[PDB]
Design a protein around this ligand. Structure first.
Ligand SMILES: CN(c1ccccc1CNc1nc(Nc2ccc3c(c2)CC(=O)N3)ncc1C(F)(F)F)S(C)(=O)=O
Length: 261
């Protein structure tokens, strides 16, 4: 069990949905230093916001995966603190924008592949992620991204990222996560472009009903855009399960390192 004394804040990382996140340091019990990020709860509305905060904590306590943010410990007390590993590189959306020219599609696929395995894992443990989006994904290194911890489950709504069912009947299933995930693949492959930036929220469903979808992205192969295309099938039962995307992407990528002279 870790205690407040073991943590030393240094600055403000930003403002999360629940309140400031702080960069700090955490000394072991062997005496070792570890850069860290500390999730805190605003001036959180009564039960509602804190409960949502706790719910996230509890899930995170349980998860364990190379491509999910590393939870280091929790200070249940007051105010309660969630200590995550820090990833200096920051959000993928921005690392994407500031490295267009440097990044080789074999990398953009590698990212997608690791996000997918993170999802397959989550699916296995009965969890859903309500925020698979490039600004909610962290860059651990150049060859490694780590998914969120926020949207993690089982308002402001990524309508532009949600399946039709997710919109009409607020149904958030693992098949709607398959849809949301493909939208995140698009986002990577399109160097941080915002999905449907031309539309306003209130008209997305309409668009998809007509059968309109996000355009192939420049660097995206055809096998991949086709795979993405199935995840956007209006009929849930039609889209691929994670286990399958992890196989296909696992191919499109080992092929991608083949096509690599
Ligand atoms: C900045 N914020 C943020 C935005 C998107 C995603 C993640 C975070 C902060 N959370 C984490 N942030 C990091 N590293 C990190 C992140 C964002 C930047 C930086 C580092 C440097 C920077 O300039 N932005 N390492 C681990 C986490 C962990 F493990 F908590 F999820 S905020 C404050 O909540 O708005």
């Amino acid at each position: 069990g870790i205690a407040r004394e073991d943590v030393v804040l240094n600055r403000i990382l930003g403002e999360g949905f629940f309140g400031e996140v702080y960069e700090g340091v955490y000394t072991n019990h062997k005496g070792e230093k570890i850069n860290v990020a500390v999730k805190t709860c605003k001036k959180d509305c009564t039960l509602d916001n804190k409960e949502k905060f706790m719910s996230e904590a509890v899930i995170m306590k349980n998860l364990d995966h190379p491509h999910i943010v590393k939870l280091i410990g929790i200070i249940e007390e007051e105010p309660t603190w969630i200590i995550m590993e820090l990833y200096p590189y920051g959000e993928l959306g921005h690392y994407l924008e500031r490295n267009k020219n440097s990044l080789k599609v074999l990398t953009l696929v590698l990212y997608s592949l690791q996000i997918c395995k993170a999802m397959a894992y989550l699916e296995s443990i009965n969890c859903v992620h309500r925020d698979i989006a490039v600004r909610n994904i962290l860059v651990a290194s150049p060859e490694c991204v780590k998914l969120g911890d926020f949207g993690l489950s089982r308002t402001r709504l990524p309508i532009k990222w949600m399946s039709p069912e997710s919109i009409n009947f607020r149904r958030f299933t693992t098949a709607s996560d398959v849809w949301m995930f493909a939208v995140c693949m698009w986002e990577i492959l399109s160097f941080g472009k915002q999905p449907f930036f031309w539309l306003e929220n209130k008209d997305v469903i309409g668009v998809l009903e007509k059968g309109d979808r996000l355009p192939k992205p420049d660097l995206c192969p055809p096998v991949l855009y086709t795979l993405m295309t199935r995840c956007w099938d209006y009929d849930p039962s039609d889209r691929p399960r994670f286990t399958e995307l992890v196989c296909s992407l696992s191919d499109v990528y080992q092929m991608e390192k083949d096509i690599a002279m």
